Every structure is written in C-alpha cells, then in structure tokens.
Design an enzyme around this catalytic site. Structure first.
Site, PDB file in Angstrom:
ATOM      1  N   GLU A  11      37.335 -67.808  13.121  1.00 39.07           N
ATOM      2  CA  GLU A  11      38.360 -67.205  13.962  1.00 39.07           C
ATOM      3  C   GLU A  11      37.718 -66.726  15.254  1.00 39.07           C
ATOM      4  O   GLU A  11      36.755 -65.956  15.220  1.00 39.07           O
ATOM      5  CB  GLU A  11      39.045 -66.042  13.237  1.00 39.07           C
ATOM      6  CG  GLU A  11      40.148 -65.365  14.027  1.00 39.07           C
ATOM      7  CD  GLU A  11      41.057 -64.530  13.148  1.00 39.07           C
ATOM      8  OE1 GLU A  11      40.590 -63.503  12.610  1.00 39.07           O
ATOM      9  OE2 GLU A  11      42.239 -64.903  12.989  1.00 39.07           O
ATOM     10  N   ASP A 114      28.446 -72.244  26.123  1.00 28.07           N
ATOM     11  CA  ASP A 114      28.676 -71.405  24.952  1.00 28.07           C
ATOM     12  C   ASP A 114      27.629 -71.659  23.879  1.00 28.07           C
ATOM     13  O   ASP A 114      27.928 -71.583  22.683  1.00 28.07           O
ATOM     14  CB  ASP A 114      30.077 -71.618  24.370  1.00 28.07           C
ATOM     15  CG  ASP A 114      30.536 -70.447  23.514  1.00 28.07           C
ATOM     16  OD1 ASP A 114      29.981 -69.341  23.679  1.00 28.07           O
ATOM     17  OD2 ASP A 114      31.441 -70.632  22.674  1.00 28.07           O
TER      18      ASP A 114
HETATM   19  C1  LIG Z   1      36.247 -76.935  14.613  1.00 23.67           C
HETATM   20  C2  LIG Z   1      35.167 -77.984  14.380  1.00 23.67           C
HETATM   21  C3  LIG Z   1      34.316 -78.206  15.629  1.00 23.67           C
HETATM   22  C4  LIG Z   1      34.293 -77.682  13.167  1.00 23.67           C
HETATM   23  C5  LIG Z   1      33.930 -78.587  12.179  1.00 23.67           C
HETATM   24  N1  LIG Z   1      33.169 -77.952  11.304  1.00 23.67           N
HETATM   25  N2  LIG Z   1      33.016 -76.620  11.716  1.00 23.67           N
HETATM   26  C6  LIG Z   1      32.318 -75.614  11.130  1.00 23.67           C
HETATM   27  N3  LIG Z   1      31.585 -75.824   9.903  1.00 23.67           N
HETATM   28  C7  LIG Z   1      30.457 -74.960   9.622  1.00 23.67           C
HETATM   29  C8  LIG Z   1      30.821 -74.006   8.490  1.00 23.67           C
HETATM   30  C9  LIG Z   1      30.836 -72.639   8.714  1.00 23.67           C
HETATM   31  C10 LIG Z   1      31.170 -71.776   7.684  1.00 23.67           C
HETATM   32  C11 LIG Z   1      31.486 -72.281   6.433  1.00 23.67           C
HETATM   33  C12 LIG Z   1      31.473 -73.646   6.212  1.00 23.67           C
HETATM   34  C13 LIG Z   1      31.143 -74.510   7.244  1.00 23.67           C
HETATM   35  C14 LIG Z   1      32.313 -74.363  11.726  1.00 23.67           C
HETATM   36  C15 LIG Z   1      33.030 -74.199  12.908  1.00 23.67           C
HETATM   37  N4  LIG Z   1      33.040 -72.903  13.555  1.00 23.67           N
HETATM   38  C16 LIG Z   1      33.847 -72.670  14.733  1.00 23.67           C
HETATM   39  C17 LIG Z   1      34.744 -71.463  14.473  1.00 23.67           C
HETATM   40  O1  LIG Z   1      35.239 -71.592  13.171  1.00 23.67           O
HETATM   41  C18 LIG Z   1      32.943 -72.399  15.931  1.00 23.67           C
HETATM   42  O2  LIG Z   1      33.723 -72.043  17.036  1.00 23.67           O
HETATM   43  C19 LIG Z   1      32.151 -73.662  16.256  1.00 23.67           C
HETATM   44  O3  LIG Z   1      33.010 -74.761  16.136  1.00 23.67           O
HETATM   45  N5  LIG Z   1      33.691 -75.227  13.429  1.00 23.67           N
HETATM   46  C20 LIG Z   1      33.678 -76.440  12.819  1.00 23.67           C
END
Ligand SMILES: CC(C)c1cnn2c(NCc3ccccc3)cc(N[C@@H](CO)[C@H](O)CO)nc12
Lengths: 287, 65, 279
Positions: A11, A114
């Site tokens: 989030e 970022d």
């Molecule tokens: C959305 C897509 C790129 C995307 C595809 N996977 N992913 C993960 N997976 C890693 C993860 C983390 C915790 C538990 C299990 C797996 C985190 C994340 N984080 C977002 C925020 O949720 C951040 O902003 C970087 O994208 N965005 C994404």
C-alpha cells in the site's frame, strides 16, 4: 473482470498492490490517475530483463488498475531478514542486476527517481527488476522542469535535498550507493528524519563537501551551509569491504553529480570484474 | 564465473551518434545552450541535451516499415 | 527511443493502401453493427476521411489557442492519438468532436503537461454547463481512447529529431552557412506533412530530414552531400537511394493532399449528426 484477488501485497501513496491469477494488480473530475498513466507510458516503451514488464491495464471510467508479473520478493525483505547472510558475491549480483537495469533505463533517457530496496523486486529465479515507475520521468530536455521532492528521503541525493530542479542519472546513482550501503550494513545507511536531518547525516558520515568536490554546490536553491565534518573514512564504515568495493562506493557517493559514476562507468569498475564473480540467480538467497 | 562488461547492443537504424564525452571536442556543444551553474550542480550538462537531440535525429533514419 | 518504440513497432504502416484498408474495415464494422442493432444514413470511408481531416484541423485550432500555452509535443501527441484512433474507429460510432478533446486531454496527461480539468475545459468557447458536459464526456471517453491506442501512449514527434538535425548541420556541414534560416520553411512543411498520413508511414527522423531538405531545395541550396558525406551514405548506395525514395514519396504525399471543402464539410457534419442522433 478476469482477475480475482488472492493476497494483499502493499500500500502506497497512490495505489494498493495485491496478487491475482500469477500476476500483481496495482489498483490506483481529474480523470485517470497520472501515476498509472506514467507507469503505462514508460513501461510500454522499455524491454529489459532487469525492468518490470507491464502485462495489462484495465478499469472503468476514471478508475484504473495495472497488471504486472508477480515478483517473489524485494530487496528490503532480503536486507531486513536477519537469517540470510549477504555474502560479497550476493551483494555484487544484486548491484550488477540493478546497474544493468539502470544502464538500460538511462540510455533511454528515463530516471527511476524512486530507487530503494523495496522497489527492487526479485523473482524465484533471482532476476532483479526495477519496479514502481510511478515517479519515473524522462530526462535530457532543458525545458522539462522537475520537482526536488523525489526519491525517498533516506536515499535522496544531496543535490535533490538542496533543491536541484534539473538533474541526471546521479539521483539514481546516489540511491544505488545508499542501497549498496544498506546491503553492506543491513540497516538504512542514512536514516534521516527530515531534509535537514538527512543532509546532516550525509555530511556527518561522508564529510561536508566543499567547492572543490562540488563546484556549484552553492548555486542550488535550497543550499544550506553545514559545519565542516571530517567524515568517517569509508574503510571504517564498511570494515569488511575490499579496495575495489570501496572504490565503487566512493564513486557512487561522490558529492559532485557529474563526477558521480554513471551506471556504465560503475559496471566497468574492477569491483564487478573481480574475484569472486556475482552470484547466479539460482543461488541468490530467498526469504 | 567473473563478470565482463559488454556494451548494450541496441540497433538504431541510423547514422552513428558521436560519443557523449566526445561532443565538446567535435564542436557540437557550440550549437546547444550552455547549462547554468545550478543545472551543473545537479548533474545536468548541455552534453545531455545535445546527445539526446542527435540520437533522436539519427534514430531510425534508415528504417523502412 | 524511436528505434525500439511502440510507434515504430505497431503504428508505422507499409503503405497508404494499408491505412485505407483499416479505415474501410472500421467503417464496414460500424455499418454491420448498426444494421444488426436495428443505407443512406451511413457515411462512406472517404466521407469519414474528410470529417477526420476537418476535425484534426479543429484539434489543431483547439490546441493553438489553449491557455496555458500547450507545448508542440503535446499537440503532436494529441494529433497522433486522433489519427490512430480513427484508423480503427468510425466517426459515426464515436463523435470526433469529443474524441479530439479526449485526445488533447490524454496527451496533456501523458506528455507531463500539468493542467487541471477545470483549466482544460475553460478553453472551450461554450457556456459553463456545456463545459461541464464536455468534461463528463471526455472522462467517459478517456479509457476508451487509451484502449483504442493499445496503451501505446508515447508518441515520437519530428520536432526533436529536427533539432538534432539542425545541430548536426551546424556542426559537420559548414557549406550550409547559417542552417537556421531553413527552420521556418521546414517547420511549415512539417505542418503540411502533419496534415497527411505521413506520421503513420514514416519515421520522425525521416519526416524531419524530408522537411529540412525540402526547405533547402526551396532555398536554392543543394545539400545531398550532407547525406553522402556527413551521413556516410556514399558507402551504402542502396541506403541513400532508399532514403531519397522515401523523401520523394513523402513530398508526393504532401503534393496530393486536398483540404476538406467547407461545402462538403457542412453536408457531412449534418450526416454525422443524423447518424449519432438516429442510433
Ligand atoms: C506491482 C508489481 C510491480 C509487483 C509485482 N510483484 N510485487 C511485489 N512482490 C514482492 C513481495 C513483497 C511482499 C510479499 C510478497 C512479495 C511487491 C511490490 N511492492 C510494491 C507495493 O506493493 C512496491 O511499490 C514496488 O512495486 N510490487 C510488486
């Protein structure tokens, strides 16, 4: 529509990320959100193994959700995991994948803006991909103004903290250095509480730069003078860091953004072409 | 298995672009606006704008649909 | 970068016949849809093209007086959006009056040109109720326009390649003293080039170079030595011949362009309004 919802992933300021069938959905009078549009427009023009690939986008009226491949973990989870040992080869491999993705991004004149461990995602095969391009922007045009409140504060370059409206790959490179430091220490390198606190921590750890190492430091709009800290020498901060790694860190943490090593220059450094070689993806640590 | 740097191989379908650090000596920078001191302080140089403009000029000039 | 862009990959077409095929397919698809839903009402593809040219000029007029001053890159992106949308869509299904405003709106968002929606709708010469309804329609059509572009939002315009060519001329072509005087005419040609289907058939670099050398030819300045010497085309003879042929075909495209006739435009506008009201 065609995607369910399985597990909440994250989030942020602009969107919430969950899993679906595996893929990740980022749900975001003004209209469609500009962050989602920026992500779509940039990720559609980029194709590299170390950059997150956009697979779909859907919505209704002004609502929008983006679809990406599911990424198993991120670098923040790796760093914060006390049970995983970050060997020099593992650190080298992470830094190498990050720098290759960043080099590809920079040749196409796009800054990530970022960079931080939780935006560096890892899959089950060990391929690191830059993610969260909601703040990424194209660079190389004088007439395009930028805002200096980019990058998380802990990874913000000093020229950004001094209010640089125009900047280049250094803002990413500095963040890269911070990530490297966070890889070596397993804790945030410069955990400031404000822009003033961030600048104070930077100058108290790396020494307050002068005009010699930063010729136009006094021209940045929000430039504030600090006491001339001697700065802890880099070999005391990173006790178990070799000379080549220290050279890489010094290049990434040069106060002059022009002199700060680019992704191509960083990749050419002896640290990367040295024993031991970077860890293969199949053997990188997984939490 | 040591790492060896390899330059990115991206076909441009156009004339060769002079190197970024070579732009000053070949006289290209005499025809782009000079970066202000505050622009220089942030890492922005006129060489960046000149290189981008030349790359855009030459990109796909010889490409045929 | 253009050389691996979506514009090069999916939105640069082999010939004008391919574009005509796409537009005719869109027209017949709307015809079949309207007949299946439940004839002189329908517009022919050439009438669709005349209306599209008229409304593209209307889009140019809207972007010309837009306040605050809209950058030329945004205008080019919006016009490219308009052309791409009506490649595969009929004006009888989606009115070009709203589609062009949606193109401008989406282009403003995509090209990082910050304008609020009230600021955008303030540029229309209508009552505020009309502006509110126009904003509503634009918001309804924004996602539709994005989907009909296949989510390819980055548009490579000829303006920055034109600037790069000017830099290269000022650097490596001394015999062209003061290349800057070639700008305005070339820019004018660019405008004319934008009216045709050139942006869907030629690269931005090719379009910029064609404009520059057309301006040079109109000036009595002959400079294919720029192509042969400075661009090293004296080695690859076929490359120089192909470039010359591409520029010749683009100049021909500009030659055989007829602006929509206002007397025909009124009839087609009434026909289109009947099409929208009747359906
Ligand atoms: C959305 C897509 C790129 C995307 C595809 N996977 N992913 C993960 N997976 C890693 C993860 C983390 C915790 C538990 C299990 C797996 C985190 C994340 N984080 C977002 C925020 O949720 C951040 O902003 C970087 O994208 N965005 C994404």
């Amino acid at each position: 529509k065609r995607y369910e919802k399985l597990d909440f992933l994250g989030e942020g300021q602009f969107a919430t990320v969950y899993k679906a069938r595996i893929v990740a959905i980022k749900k975001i009078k003004d209209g469609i959100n500009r962050t989602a549009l920026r992500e779509i427009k940039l990720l559609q023009e980029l194709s590299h193994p170390n950059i997150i690939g956009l697979l779909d986008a859907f919505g209704h009226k002004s609502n929008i959700s983006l679809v990406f491949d599911f990424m198993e973990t991120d670098l923040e989870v790796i760093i914060k995991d006390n049970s995983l040992v970050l060997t020099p080869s593992h650190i080298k491999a992470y830094m190498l994948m990050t720098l290759q993705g960043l080099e590809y991004l920079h040749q196409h004149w796009i800054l990530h803006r970022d960079l931080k461990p939780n935006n560096l995602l890892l899959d089950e095969n060990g391929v690191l991909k830059l993610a969260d391009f909601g703040l990424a922007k194209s660079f190389g045009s004088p007439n395009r103004a930028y805002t200096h409140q980019v990058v998380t504060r802990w990874y913000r370059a000093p020229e950004l903290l001094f209010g640089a409206r125009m900047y280049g790959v250094g803002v990413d490179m500095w963040a890269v250095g911070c990530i490297l430091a966070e890889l070596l220490l397993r804790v945030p390198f410069l955990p400031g509480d404000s822009d003033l606190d961030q600048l104070t921590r930077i100058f108290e750890t790396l020494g307050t730069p002068t005009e010699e190492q930063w010729p136009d430091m006094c021209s940045l709009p929000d430039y504030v003078t600090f006491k001339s800290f001697p700065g802890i020498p880099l070999h005391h901060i990173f006790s178990a860091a070799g000379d080549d790694l220290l050279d890489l860190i010094q290049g990434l943490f040069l106060f002059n953004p022009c002199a700060r090593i680019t992704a191509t220059q960083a990749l050419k450094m002896k640290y990367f072409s040295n024993r031991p070689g970077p860890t293969p993806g199949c053997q990188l640590p997984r939490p | 298995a040591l790492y060896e740097y390899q330059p990115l191989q991206i076909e441009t379908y156009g004339p060769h672009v002079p190197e970024l650090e070579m732009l000053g000596r070949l006289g290209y920078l005499n025809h782009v606006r000079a970066a202000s001191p505050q622009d220089l302080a942030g890492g922005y140089t006129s060489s960046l704008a000149c290189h981008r403009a030349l790359q855009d000029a030459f990109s796909g000039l010889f490409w045929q649909p | 970068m253009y050389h691996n862009s979506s514009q090069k990959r999916h939105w640069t077409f082999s010939s004008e016949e391919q574009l005509a095929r796409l537009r005719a397919d869109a027209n017949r698809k709307f015809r079949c849809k309207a007949v299946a839903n439940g004839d002189p009402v329908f517009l022919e593809p050439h009438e669709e093209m005349t209306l599209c040219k008229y409304y593209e000029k209307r889009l140019l007029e809207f972007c010309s007086v837009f306040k605050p001053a809209m950058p030329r890159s945004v205008v080019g992106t919006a016009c490219m959006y308009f052309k791409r949308f009506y490649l595969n869509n009929s004006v009888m299904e989606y009115h070009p009056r709203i589609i062009m405003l949606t193109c401008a709106f989406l282009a403003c968002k995509v090209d990082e040109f910050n304008v609020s929606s009230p600021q955008f709708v303030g540029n229309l010469r209508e009552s505020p109720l009309g502006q509110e309804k126009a904003l509503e329609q634009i918001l309804e059509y924004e996602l539709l326009l994005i989907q009909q572009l296949n989510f390819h939002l980055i548009v490579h315009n000829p303006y920055r390649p034109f600037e790069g060519f000017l830099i290269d001329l000022k650097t490596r072509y001394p015999i062209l003293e003061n290349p800057e005087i070639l700008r305005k005419t070339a820019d004018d040609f660019l405008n004319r080039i934008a009216l045709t289907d050139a942006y869907l058939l030629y690269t931005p670099s090719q379009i910029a170079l064609t404009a520059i050398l057309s301006s040079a030819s109109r000036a009595g300045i002959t400079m294919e030595s720029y192509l042969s010497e400075s661009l090293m085309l004296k080695e690859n003879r076929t490359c120089l011949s192909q470039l010359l042929d591409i520029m010749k075909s683009m100049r021909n495209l500009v030659k055989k362009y007829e602006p929509p006739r206002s007397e025909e435009v009124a009839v087609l506008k009434q026909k289109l309004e009947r099409c929208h009201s009747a359906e």
